[PDB]
Design a protein around this ligand. Structure first.
Ligand SMILES: CN(C)C(=O)c1ccc(-c2cc(C(=O)N[C@@H]3CCc4ccccc43)no2)cc1O
Length: 138
C-alpha cells in the first residue's frame, strides 16, 4: 500500500570575481526540487531552510516553488532543511541536514545534488492522491 516519491536537494557555490563590501567571497544557492516531470508542490506544504545564525533572518521559508535560498557568504556549514507535507498522519515533515560546502578560489565551482526517496506506507486517501498527483509511484 506504499507510495514512493523523490526529492532532490542540492546547492551551487561559486567564488565571486570580486568579494562584497562585507568580504563575502562566494555566491551560493541551495534548493529542494522534484525530478523532471514531477510537481512536488502537490504534497509539499513548505520548505524551511535554517541558515547559520551569522545570516540575518536565518529561517527562510518557501511556501511555493522554487524552494530555494540564494545568498552570499564566506564559509560553508551544515544547513538543516525541513520539508513539510500536506499530510494529517506521521510523518508530517522530514529534516535533512544538508552539507553546504564551498570550494577554494582557483578551483571549479560546486554544483552538487543529493537524491532522497521518501516511502509513505499506508498513506490516507487524501495524501495518497497528492503523492500520485506529484508523480509518485504506487
Ligand atoms: C544585506 N546583507 C548584506 C545581507 O542580507 C547579508 C548579511 C550577512 C550575510 C552573511 C553571510 C555570512 C556567512 O557566510 N557566514 C558563515 C556561514 C558559516 C559560518 C561560520 C562561522 C562564521 C561565519 C560563517 N555571514 O553573514 C549575508 C547576507 O546576505
Amino acid at each position: 500500500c506504499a507510495v514512493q516519491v523523490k526529492l532532490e536537494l542540492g546547492h551551487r557555490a561559486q567564488v565571486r570575481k570580486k568579494p562584497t563590501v562585507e568580504g563575502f567571497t562566494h555566491d551560493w544557492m541551495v534548493f529542494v526540487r522534484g525530478p523532471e516531470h514531477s510537481n512536488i508542490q502537490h504534497f509539499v506544504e513548505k520548505v524551511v531552510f535554517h541558515l547559520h545564525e551569522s545570516f540575518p533572518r536565518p529561517k527562510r521559508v518557501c511556501k511555493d516553488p522554487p524552494y530555494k535560498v540564494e545568498e552570499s557568504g564566506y564559509a560553508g556549514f551544515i544547513l538543516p532543511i525541513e520539508v513539510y507535507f500536506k499530510n494529517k498522519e506521521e510523518p508530517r515533515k522530514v529534516r535533512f541536514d544538508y552539507d553546504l560546502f564551498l570550494h577554494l578560489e582557483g578551483h571549479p565551482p560546486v554544483n552538487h545534488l543529493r537524491c532522497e526517496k521518501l516511502t509513505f506506507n499506508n498513506p490516507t486517501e487524501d495524501f495518497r492522491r497528492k503523492l500520485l498527483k506529484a508523480g509518485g509511484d504506487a
